Write a protein that binds this ligand. Structure first.
Ligand SMILES: [Ca+2]
Ligand SMILES: [Fe+3]
Ligand code: NA
Ligand code: NA
Length: 285
């Protein structure tokens, strides 16, 4: 009876695919809770204690004082974002001097993350190196196909509509990869393609200036739809919408920014379908 701990479901659902039945995977954070400000609850310390490996996002996602006590200096911790940064697997995004942790919306980056999960798991359990690797090979090639599917579907969004207004800044990596051109990527003008009244963390206070910023962006770019997120307070986007002159609506289905609906993979699919359809594209089969 062996236990491996993942901080959240975006990590846990990939770890569980590599290991299958040969281990018990537990997840610390799930459901409608903000991972950014998660504080450990009773029993969480014991979940870490009984586990063989603790898989973290890094990049400041586990930044609460509770988690920092238990994770900083812990030899069980696999810091997926730091390991990916250790190889320039991706270019870190930031906002006003804090790192952007939301790399799991970019399926190429999260594939690299899963590569580190598999390696880390295999390094801890050489006796499972072979089943682990087989399953890793499978999920990794499924994620590459998922990534191609997303890029192709999101490419059908008319360029005049490639402007993503969300609750907080959880889709910067998504936007840079899937909504922006090579020229916008190299220049950095890809950043014109997404905005949100809240920053990287839902915990920050949203001001009338943030409302106004997003309202002017909506009117400058003729954005017709904005996207609510599951578990994020909806007051700010609802105010932004009401403060229009000028057609503007809420997207039909919510996006999943910091959490998972059924599983991480179906959630990515749902997000891509939702964004593609509402911004005027056509989802590939
Ligand atoms: Ca421990
Ligand atoms: Fe977030
Ligand atoms: Na402000
Ligand atoms: Na306008």
């Amino acid at each position: 009876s062996i236990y491996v701990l993942s901080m959240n479901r975006m990590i846990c659902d990939c770890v569980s695919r590599i290991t299958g039945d040969r281990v018990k995977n537990i997840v610390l954070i799930d459901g409608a809770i903000d991972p950014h400000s998660y504080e450990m609850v009773k029993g969480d310390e014991d979940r870490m204690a009984m586990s063989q490996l603790i898989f973290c996002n890094g990049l400041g996602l586990e930044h609460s004082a509770s988690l920092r006590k238990h994770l900083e200096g812990n030899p069980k911790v696999v810091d997926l974002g730091q390991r990916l940064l250790n190889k320039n697997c991706f270019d870190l995004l930031s906002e006003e001097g804090f790192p952007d942790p939301h790399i799991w919306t970019d399926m190429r980056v999260w594939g690299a993350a899963v590569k580190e999960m598999a390696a880390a798991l295999i390094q801890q359990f050489p006796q499972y190196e072979e089943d682990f690797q087989k399953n890793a090979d499978q999920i990794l090639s499924e994620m590459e196909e998922l990534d191609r599917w997303a890029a192709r579907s999101l490419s059908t969004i008319p360029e005049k509509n490639r402007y993503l207004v969300t609750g907080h800044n959880a889709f910067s990596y998504f936007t840079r990869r899937y909504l922006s051109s090579d020229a916008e990527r190299v220049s950095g003008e890809w950043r014109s393609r997404c905005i949100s009244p809240e920053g990287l963390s839902p915990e920050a206070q949203i001001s009338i200036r943030d409302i106004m910023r997003v309202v002017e962006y909506i009117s400058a770019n003729d954005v017709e739809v904005v996207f609510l997120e599951d578990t994020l307070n909806q007051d700010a986007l609802r105010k932004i919408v009401s403060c229009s002159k000028q057609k503007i609506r809420l997207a039909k289905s919510p996006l999943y920014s910091d959490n998972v609906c059924d599983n991480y993979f179906s959630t990515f699919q749902h997000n891509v379908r939702t964004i593609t359809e509402e911004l005027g594209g056509t989802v590939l089969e």
